[PDB]
Scaffold this motif. Sequence first.
Motif, short mmCIF file in Angstrom:
data_model
loop_
_atom_site.label_atom_id
_atom_site.label_comp_id
_atom_site.label_asym_id
_atom_site.label_seq_id
_atom_site.Cartn_x
_atom_site.Cartn_y
_atom_site.Cartn_z
N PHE A 254 -71.04 -15.29 56.41
CA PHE A 254 -72.09 -15.49 57.41
C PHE A 254 -73.45 -14.94 56.95
O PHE A 254 -74.48 -15.58 57.14
N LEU B 62 -81.30 -13.20 68.16
CA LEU B 62 -80.65 -13.93 69.25
C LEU B 62 -79.91 -13.02 70.26
O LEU B 62 -78.86 -13.37 70.76
N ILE C 68 -73.24 -8.92 63.52
CA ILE C 68 -72.33 -9.11 62.39
C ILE C 68 -72.67 -8.24 61.19
O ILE C 68 -71.77 -7.83 60.45
N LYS C 69 -73.97 -7.96 61.00
CA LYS C 69 -74.41 -7.09 59.91
C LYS C 69 -73.93 -5.66 60.12
O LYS C 69 -73.54 -4.98 59.17
N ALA D 256 -75.92 -14.23 71.22
CA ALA D 256 -75.17 -15.04 70.25
C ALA D 256 -74.07 -14.24 69.53
O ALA D 256 -73.69 -14.59 68.42
N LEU E 208 -64.91 -15.89 61.24
CA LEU E 208 -65.50 -14.72 60.62
C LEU E 208 -64.36 -13.84 60.14
O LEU E 208 -64.57 -12.75 59.61
N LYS F 268 -74.88 -16.91 54.19
CA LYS F 268 -75.05 -18.32 54.55
C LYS F 268 -74.21 -19.27 53.67
O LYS F 268 -74.72 -20.24 53.12
N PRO G 69 -66.30 -18.05 68.70
CA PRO G 69 -66.10 -18.47 67.31
C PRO G 69 -65.83 -17.32 66.33
O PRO G 69 -66.03 -17.51 65.13
N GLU G 70 -65.38 -16.16 66.83
CA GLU G 70 -64.98 -15.01 66.00
C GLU G 70 -64.02 -15.38 64.90
O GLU G 70 -64.15 -14.91 63.77
N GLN H 253 -85.34 -11.38 67.56
CA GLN H 253 -85.22 -11.66 66.12
C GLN H 253 -83.76 -11.88 65.69
O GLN H 253 -83.50 -12.32 64.58
N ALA I 79 -71.70 -10.20 69.06
CA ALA I 79 -71.89 -8.87 68.51
C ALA I 79 -72.60 -9.01 67.16
O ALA I 79 -72.46 -10.05 66.49
#
Lengths: 252, 253, 255
Positions: A242, C25, C67-68, C63, C134, A245, C130-131, C23, C65
């Motif tokens: 993710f 969502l 993710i980074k 949008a 990931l 990308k 949609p977890e 920045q 939790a």
Amino acid sequence: TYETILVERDQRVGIITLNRPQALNALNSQVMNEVTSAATELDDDPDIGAIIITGSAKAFAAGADIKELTFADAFTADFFATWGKLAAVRTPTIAAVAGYALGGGCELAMMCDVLIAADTAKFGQPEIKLGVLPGMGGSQRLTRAIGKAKAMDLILTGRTMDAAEAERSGLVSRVVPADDLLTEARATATTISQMSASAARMAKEAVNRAFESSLSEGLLYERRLFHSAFATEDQSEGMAAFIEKRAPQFTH
Amino acid sequence: TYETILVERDQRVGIITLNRPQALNALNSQVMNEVTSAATELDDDPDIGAIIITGSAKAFAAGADIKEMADLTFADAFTADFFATWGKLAAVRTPTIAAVAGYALGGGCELAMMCDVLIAADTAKFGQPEIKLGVLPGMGGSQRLTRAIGKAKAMDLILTGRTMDAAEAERSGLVSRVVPADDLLTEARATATTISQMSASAARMAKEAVNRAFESSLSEGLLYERRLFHSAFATEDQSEGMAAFIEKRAPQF
Amino acid sequence: MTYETILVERDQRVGIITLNRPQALNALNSQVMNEVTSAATELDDDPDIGAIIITGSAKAFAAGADIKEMADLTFADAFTADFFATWGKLAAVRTPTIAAVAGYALGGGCELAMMCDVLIAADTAKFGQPEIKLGVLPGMGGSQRLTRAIGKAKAMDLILTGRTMDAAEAERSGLVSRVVPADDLLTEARATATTISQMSASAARMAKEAVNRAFESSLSEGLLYERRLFHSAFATEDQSEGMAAFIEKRAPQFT
Ligand SMILES: CC(C)(COP(=O)(O)OP(=O)(O)OC[C@H]1O[C@@H](n2cnc3c(N)ncnc32)[C@H](O)[C@@H]1OP(=O)(O)O)[C@@H](O)C(=O)NCCC(=O)NCCS
């Protein structure tokens, strides 16, 4: 060598087709044993990530069998209990239903996780007319799905419910035109079989928990499994993908 | 003979009709008592296989007599176990049908939800307006409505007092069917007749299996259903329904 | 308090919490979690509030939790922190809460809207989980609350394919209370919260608690619980005034 079912392997997807078309895919002991043995076999295969169960364009399954005596005979045999092997399958399952899904056939459709229904699908529990009760979890899965007023109605009157009503009530995932059922099932199955096998198994287990305990316990169980995802190659890859990308590359 | 209700027997079907049209069939202590007494007696009648509860075309039951509650203390409420008698309706083993026209508000909406099958005229308006008078549902609405239509909509109805029409009630899981207002009563008879023509035993066991889905884990509910399923191969009635189907004839239960 | 990731306003008896990470969502990080819970908690404690709205922007409610934040979490980090547990502070809030959902509410965004009592959605709303893909699964209650709201076949569908659900399907499936045109979302939510915040404070708190019960025990139990709660209401001043007022054909004046 199955007599009443066909089994096909297509990449990470396995398909069980009920193959007793004359009897409108009526469910019996043998069907029960074969369907359950094949799904269990597909569950054990690391090269499979989704299982489809489907019938004909005329009938997913029209009911149980009628020729198929004591109470002890039923108690000792645990008549219908083997169906429980379908629910113990860890790999996601998909009911692709066309036409008649009545009695047991409706109950089998309900044992799968995802239910994609044809245009033409019709659901019902009409065995009250024969003075018979559901024995495959119908009074249990129906009520949790569509609520009491409709569950009672179907079970006490035997009326049918068409695809559109099953969709608006919570019985089905989504509805598709009849001609496209098998391709939509396969594309759905394909998408799920390309997920991380661990994550897909975890996600399914967490959802099933929604009918086995209180919300507070389900929430706790989910949060714990979610932390466990973090001990896996696949959580790292999925999230790295993710941020970079790119498509995620799971080795499941 | 009753003061606030009428009771009619026709074949294997019983029909309880609320009879306070001036007050829109608003529920009170006396109504509660009579319906329960009538419901219980129809349940005990072996020549009765289904029970209908209905009001009038204007209201199934809109609200309750608020004068009977204005000056209740917690102590009076706890001692009387206020509203508990309505539990006798849910304990009826025979299938019950709510035929709801017009307003089914507060207690009236809760009364409809206690029945097994809910048949609504297109005129039916459902709502839990209790909040307005400083209270919450008292006859199981917070429990039954939420289970029927989900948290989001139940929170909405109970916290704002807003009404929900017959169509929204059909799509959200509250009613079994919507029919035209003019056909309401006839359609309830049709459904009650069909139910009353089933094996009395099988119909009661099926109703009891369904009610379990709100009382335990699926796991437990599945086991209970299977055990009771096996018990209906014992019983004469399953031979007749079976022979009827092979001989393409009507079953004589 | 003073916040980085949210905006907080109060107007009469209604507090509004607006998510403020545009920045990203409104993606939900630990900072957002803590700030939303602290704000909601301190509004719940304020006697002059009767309803709390949680909202985002026209473009995204949230949008997911963040993710980074999660990418560089080790199992030890997650287990040690009990990652996400703190959102439970929001479910413990006693004052009625309203989710006002425009645009994306996915993953923890969907989960967050599901934690509220009332869910008003713009016609523009898009729900999903949609977890999966990931390499994870819902970690904030989606597998629980989604299933319960919309049923197994649809919850399994969304959670394993990660497909989206639009506002109209959400409304017909049991996920949202009501849909309104997007332009009216904030106007509508605010009118709903006004109505709720003008009701009796105790009644609305009791009723919210009773409804929540219906997911926590069998029906027998919830029914007994509701009735006992109903009987206590008779010790409340607002029952008295609410009922007195009705009888006298006038408006109630809650003290
Ligand atoms: C909702 C979405 C479809 C729309 O995205 P979009 O319009 O293409 O916009 P972007 O991806 O540019 O938008 C967002 C950006 O905000 C950030 N962002 C969006 N969602 C984010 C998230 N959940 N976590 C962290 N950052 C996020 C992106 O990384 C990017 O940031 P960057 O600019 O600093 O790299 C998309 O951002 C997305 O789907 N995100 C992830 C959703 C998800 O999988 N959620 C939960 C399951 S674990």
